[PDB]
Design a protein around this ligand. Structure first.
Ligand SMILES: Cc1ccc(C(=O)N2CCN(C(=O)NCC(F)(F)F)CC2)o1
Length: 119
């Protein structure tokens, strides 16, 4: 019933994500010299360094907000990919599975803790 615990739980999950080779393409912004069409296709860039910085700044109120930005990383990769069998998109799908597997308890515990707080 700790309604602050999500933040360190998210910090540790981001640490795991940064250790994971599959996160390489998603740790920083897209160079438009390398992908000149990227911002034609993608209105709202997002990367794991921006998510970590937002968390560390104290600019997420809940793990739901963090989860929305992480999911945007993945939806951006799905929108940008030229193919469902693109290397970087395939990395996104494995990393998304890993993230969803690990964030589910963080969201459950937060929402339970907040229901207890308001009981
Ligand atoms: C070919 C394909 C399919 C899907 C994606 C994709 O999701 N992108 C574009 C490449 N990208 C970076 O260029 N990331 C920056 C750095 F420094 F890590 F390279 C990550 C986002 O790209």
């Amino acid at each position: 019933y700790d309604i602050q615990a999500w933040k360190k739980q998210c910090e540790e999950l981001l640490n795991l994500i940064f250790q994971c080779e599959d996160s390489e393409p998603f740790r920083q912004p897209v160079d438009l010299l390398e992908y000149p069409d990227y911002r034609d296709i993608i209105d709202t860039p997002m990367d794991f360094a921006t998510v970590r910085e937002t968390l560390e700044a104290g600019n997420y109120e809940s793990p739901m907000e963090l989860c929305k930005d992480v999911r945007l990383i993945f939806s951006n990769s799905k929108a940008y990919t030229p193919s469902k069998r693109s290397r970087i998109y395939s990395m996104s799908l494995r990393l998304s599975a890993f993230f969803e597997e690990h964030i589910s308890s963080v969201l459950s515990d937060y929402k339970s803790a907040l229901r207890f707080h308001k009981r």
